[PDB]
Amino acid sequence: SRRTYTLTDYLKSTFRVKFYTLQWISDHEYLYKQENNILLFNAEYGNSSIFLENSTFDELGYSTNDYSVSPDRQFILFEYNYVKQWRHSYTASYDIYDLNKRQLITEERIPNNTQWITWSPVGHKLAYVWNNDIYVKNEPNLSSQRITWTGKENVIYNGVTDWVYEEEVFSAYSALWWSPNGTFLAYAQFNDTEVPLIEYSFYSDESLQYPKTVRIPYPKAGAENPTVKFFVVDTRTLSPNASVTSYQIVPPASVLIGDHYLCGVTWVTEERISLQWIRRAQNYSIIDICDYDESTGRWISSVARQHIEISTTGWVGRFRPAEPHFTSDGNSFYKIISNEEGYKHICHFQTDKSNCTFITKGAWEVIGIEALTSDYLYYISNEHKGMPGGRNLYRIQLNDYTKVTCLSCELNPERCQYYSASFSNKAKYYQLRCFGPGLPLYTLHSSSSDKELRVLEDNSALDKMLQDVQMPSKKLDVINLHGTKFWYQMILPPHFDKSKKYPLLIEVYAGPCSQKVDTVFRLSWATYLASTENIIVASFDGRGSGYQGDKIMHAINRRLGTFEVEDQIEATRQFSKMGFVDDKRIAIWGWSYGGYVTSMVLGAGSGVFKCGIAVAPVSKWEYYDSVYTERYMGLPTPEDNLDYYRNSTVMSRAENFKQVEYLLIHGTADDNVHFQQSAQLSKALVDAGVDFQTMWYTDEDHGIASNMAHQHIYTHMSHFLKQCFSLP
Amino acid sequence: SRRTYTLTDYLKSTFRVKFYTLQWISDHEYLYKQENNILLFNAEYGNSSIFLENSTFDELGYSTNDYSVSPDRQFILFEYNYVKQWRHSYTASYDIYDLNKRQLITEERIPNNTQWITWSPVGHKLAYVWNNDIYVKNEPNLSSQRITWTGKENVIYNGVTDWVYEEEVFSAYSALWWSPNGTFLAYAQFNDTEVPLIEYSFYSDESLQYPKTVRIPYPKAGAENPTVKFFVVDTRTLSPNASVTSYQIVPPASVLIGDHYLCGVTWVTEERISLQWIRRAQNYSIIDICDYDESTGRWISSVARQHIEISTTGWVGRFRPAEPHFTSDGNSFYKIISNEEGYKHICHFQTDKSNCTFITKGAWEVIGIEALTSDYLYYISNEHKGMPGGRNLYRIQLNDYTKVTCLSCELNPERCQYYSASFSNKAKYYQLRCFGPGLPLYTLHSSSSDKELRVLEDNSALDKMLQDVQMPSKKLDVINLHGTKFWYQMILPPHFDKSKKYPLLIEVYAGPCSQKVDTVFRLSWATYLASTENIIVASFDGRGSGYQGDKIMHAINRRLGTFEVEDQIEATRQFSKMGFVDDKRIAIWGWSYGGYVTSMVLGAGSGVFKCGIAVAPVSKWEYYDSVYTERYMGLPTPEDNLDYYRNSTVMSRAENFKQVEYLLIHGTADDNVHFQQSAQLSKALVDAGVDFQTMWYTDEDHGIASNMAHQHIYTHMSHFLKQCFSLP
Numbered sequence A, B: 001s002r003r004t005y006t007l008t009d010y011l012k013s014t015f016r017v018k019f020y021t022l023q024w025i026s027d028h029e030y031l032y033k034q035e036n037n038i039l040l041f042n043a044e045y046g047n048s049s050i051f052l053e054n055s056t057f058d059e060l061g062y063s064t065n066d067y068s069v070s071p072d073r074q075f076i077l078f079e080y081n082y083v084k085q086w087r088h089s090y091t092a093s094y095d096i097y098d099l100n101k102r103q104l105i106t107e108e109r110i111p112n113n114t115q116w117i118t119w120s121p122v123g124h125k126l127a128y129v130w131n132n133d134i135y136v137k138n139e140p141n142l143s144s145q146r147i148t149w150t151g152k153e154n155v156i157y158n159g160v161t162d163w164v165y166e167e168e169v170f171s172a173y174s175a176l177w178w179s180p181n182g183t184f185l186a187y188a189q190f191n192d193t194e195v196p197l198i199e200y201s202f203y204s205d206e207s208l209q210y211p212k213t214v215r216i217p218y219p220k221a222g223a224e225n226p227t228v229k230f231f232v233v234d235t236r237t238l239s240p241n242a243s244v245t246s247y248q249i250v251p252p253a254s255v256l257i258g259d260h261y262l263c264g265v266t267w268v269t270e271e272r273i274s275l276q277w278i279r280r281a282q283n284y285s286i287i288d289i290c291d292y293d294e295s296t297g298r299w300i301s302s303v304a305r306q307h308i309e310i311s312t313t314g315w316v317g318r319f320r321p322a323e324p325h326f327t328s329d330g331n332s333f334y335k336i337i338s339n340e341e342g343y344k345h346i347c348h349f350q351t352d353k354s355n356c357t358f359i360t361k362g363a364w365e366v367i368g369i370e371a372l373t374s375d376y377l378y379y380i381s382n383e384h385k386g387m388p389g390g391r392n393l394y395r396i397q398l399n400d401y402t403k404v405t406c407l408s409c410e411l412n413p414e415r416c417q418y419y420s421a422s423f424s425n426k427a428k429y430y431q432l433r434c435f436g437p438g439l440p441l442y443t444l445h446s447s448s449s450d451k452e453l454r455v456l457e458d459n460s461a462l463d464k465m466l467q468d469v470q471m472p473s474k475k476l477d478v479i480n481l482h483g484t485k486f487w488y489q490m491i492l493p494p495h496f497d498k499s500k501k502y503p504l505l506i507e508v509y510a511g512p513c514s515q516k517v518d519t520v521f522r523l524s525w526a527t528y529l530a531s532t533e534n535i536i537v538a539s540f541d542g543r544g545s546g547y548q549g550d551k552i553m554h555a556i557n558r559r560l561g562t563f564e565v566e567d568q569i570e571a572t573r574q575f576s577k578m579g580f581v582d583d584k585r586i587a588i589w590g591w592s593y594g595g596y597v598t599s600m601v602l603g604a605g606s607g608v609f610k611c612g613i614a615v616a617p618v619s620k621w622e623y624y625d626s627v628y629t630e631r632y633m634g635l636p637t638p639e640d641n642l643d644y645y646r647n648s649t650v651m652s653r654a655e656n657f658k659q660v661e662y663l664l665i666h667g668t669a670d671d672n673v674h675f676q677q678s679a680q681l682s683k684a685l686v687d688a689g690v691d692f693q694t695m696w697y698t699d700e701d702h703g704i705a706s707n708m709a710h711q712h713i714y715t716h717m718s719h720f721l722k723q724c725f726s727l728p
Ligand SMILES: *[C@@H]1O[C@H](CO)[C@@H](O[C@@H]2O[C@H](CO)[C@@H](O[C@@H]3O[C@H](CO)[C@@H](O)[C@H](O)[C@@H]3O)[C@H](O)[C@H]2NC(C)=O)[C@H](O)[C@H]1NC(C)=O
Pocket: A035, A036, A037, A054, A055
């Protein structure tokens, strides 16, 4: 009998996966929210005490969306009235609560509609952005000091990013960086004066008689980009009747000569800051390490302290160049860069010398550097078992790079093959986060002995619940395409009968450096499709995919829509020969870059796919943003790459859609992949005489994530697939 | 014969319906284009002569889409470079050709992008609107003289209407009226300064990197309306060094008192003009007959020359008050108004008296007055056979209202029951245009004895072609609803088998004064559904429908979405009882008001309809324009009709859509029923967890009329209906 995992199970999150979020606040203590109380845990012995009782929240009078405790632990910030903006940005109201006198501060309160706020790294100073300008509050009860006066809606942004820097460069809204001891406050200023505006209708509540027009400075491929300025403010002199003491640091001449982006800021010491810049082409970046000159207040650059990173086969880094990890003294740093074999590994650099020494090597890649001490460097890589979709924490001895230990590989080999980690200050302890293939497992460890101190969350509750349900299994393996081994995964229906022929849904992402095949545990729409509807859902990482070296990743350089699309077709062709696949019922779907590939695949005329669903797809590269698009395609000009921009549109393949059943879905308020992309695509299909189906989602953005829209789109897509597969 | 009328036949117009368009230019002559050239036909003898040979058309720029010969026959305007704007408005380029010299006017050319142009009634003066300002040219070869200087895009309109006046008041773009002998040029000025703008994206050709935002001053229900000023210009003094001599005529005090509209302008003599105004509420209108005062140049009104028309049960007229038809001397006029019984009939008014005398009466209505001479009045009515969906031409003797003769009733009784007419200058001759129920037939008659004279176009070619196709048959009949007889029509599949149970499609309009049931012959989508897919298509005119008296038409006053919706359900229930109808397969569809009613019907939870399709439906009256909406609903305020605005939205019935399969279609560039309406409806259905289908049409307007979109929508709707009806 047994219950299966149903669409409703997926949509209502009936089977809850638990996690354990902690905030390290010292080298051996972390804050954790439990039953709405804020508890202070001591790692040394496992004991804890109440840091803030939940009664305090009952007393506030508003739904508290989040909180942040001052480093000296004297104050806590309460965030409420949360209003989402783009992928990372939002605005909110904030109250500061005095933990000593356990009273709420009511004098000189933080303004409503605040865009960003952060405590200094030590003490309890605050810096925040409001109306695009920066403000600094030395004391929670004292008036704040305005730092910038140029902030202007849709034009000048001080301390927060504009749309494209938020989405494609920083992957954050914040653009301010306090120095380690709070002496200086660095910030970036973005100028969008010349950037064209994307405009679209937002309908709002039914009572709004006239729709509003949203306007966002958004540079599409080849358009005018925002400019940026970087400043370091000496906060020691801030005073109501004092001017602001600040110094502008410009990029090195090799980047200054043309359009560029600021892509990284790293404080090294109180008097040394590292700036990472990249040319608009994105195959040339430079790290500039500037020293504070105490006699003049300026920040000095030197050719000796500059480090260039380039790429001859594609772009630099995965989505941006990797960040440098400096030693405490700041005289050298470690950073992931492509080695001579095209694999991303850790290189050790001396701050004032240009050559580096690789400390890791092999046909696998380091994902990120997690922590560094005078004696060891901790990092995550997919070296274990040589599987690119796995992740483990390793520790390397700095005085002898040949001494490397895998700290997580053998803890729970069958249950845990994909880890992330979080270290306390000075890396004395670490939380290990196991995400699959079994149920997520959160544990705490001691770095001095590498003993597991305790299990923080093991998902025993979920485990129980799932025993009564017929869950599908997820299998990973490899296939060969053009002489290269590539990975795939299949979510297989319960009681999988190798004998029977099942319909097959290809779920696709496939963007540059994408990784859709991994050992992560997920309760997804695919889980329901396999468990209840008996559909095999497969994914494949082909050319252009990441974490397998530049030869694979850079294969689609300057030619998006070619090899990654062809590989999905070839992989599927091989899947359709495995014997348990009903070749009469093969579909493909994807969101975003996956919607573009899904559409390009359906437009290929391969005869492999009966139907497909594209959600919020890119349809023509000139419609997407400059930073992302140009990174992989260059400029849409005849002198550069216009030809490949032109024959990589989905519209160019309209005629082939006559042989397939297609469902095109898009939110009308998508600020990222504009509804325009699907509107131009449908128009080309209508012009070619192609019948297909559509579904717009009013006022939904790129995530089509409102609670009702989320339920609606998956329900609608389930119906479409089941009709395509003749499933009742 | 064994083939049917196919979707391709409909979409590609394989079967051509011919017509005969002529332009009367004297009391006995008309111009007609034959094989690209213009011929001058003599009605009397039937002999023609070349007036303007073909080939003379040097495809100037593009092609001549229309011509106009000056009254004195000395010149001819060629219209080309046609660029559509809204329903009636468009811009074009014009060339003037001298018929005497047989030369093209090469100097002082009409501007490119001219909004409206017209010859004076006599002679050959020209008046035209360009960039929202009026210009007059006394001679084709002479420079034009500017009349207004206030023209401003989206703000001030001189000589042409703004959006709402074009669509809802004048049903025309022109707002210029020459006096009978060309002395005066009257015009209206519209001021949209305070009218809110509807804004929506227009994507344009795929090459446009950023979408455009269209903005149109459009007053939704209850919003600030445009204001109007009416002027009469004395063209005798127009000179480059002279100012403009003009006089502004304001409405009578009883209308000037509040928001109002100018709804009619009729020149009576060279010194008398008739203005018809209506209050914003549209239940009070007044005709003001002003006389020119030769000593001061003023146009004077007098209470004795004012005629009031009001409605206590609804609005005035069908869509606006009917126009007065003055006698040659201007001392009296004839106008259609509602009877004591609520039937629209012709009343004879004395220009300076308040009481009028009805010259027609009966349980039927006069549709319009076509021509007037000193002895007779010709009008069109649906008196014949008591079928309101029929139309015939009548003549009534002015000195004896007992003498009324039907001129078209008996010409071809079985083939022709729906006519319109076009009379020569002194009503000496008239063209009769038969539109059905048989193939259209155009004929020429003489008024003297009403002799048939000749057949202009009989469609014998279409007839020959159709004998080989299995055509469906159209039948009209009546059903009794709550004591009243209402008409319906059914398009029945060929070789109809009474033993079979046919699926049924209700095609609905149902707006106030609508008439969906008539004896007009049409080759439509329904012809195809019945001929090829064996689907019966029916239509019904219930409460709120027109041409059957005010009791039926005003039934839905201040309550749109109630009785007309309920009557479609009740009528369908009766049809469902017929043994040859499969009551388990009934669908309903409509466009515009019909989309609204289709949606309201589907949301009624009646259990009668399995599925339906709404194309560009109104979904909430507060989103539609002020003139149309308020005419039937009053104001959306608590003191007036807010309660009925609130419970007549489609969104209020969202829950009930869970019982049906619904397809919602809308053009994103719809300037009339804004995409907003469907965007808000879809969001409410999503919010209620209801599944349905949608189809947006990029850049299509209210008619979804471009060649490829037209084919695509009907093809898509056909597949949706076949799927709903389980038809192969
Ligand atoms: C404020 O803090 C108190 C703790 O002092 C919260 O009380 C605790 O509430 C949790 C949540 O319901 C209780 O846990 C439950 O325990 C049973 C164990 O059998 C388990 O079945 C549930 O799944 C859950 O784990 C906990 O026992 C209880 N502890 C105390 C001290 O009574 C209280 O909920 C907080 N108030 C608010 C408004 O959050």
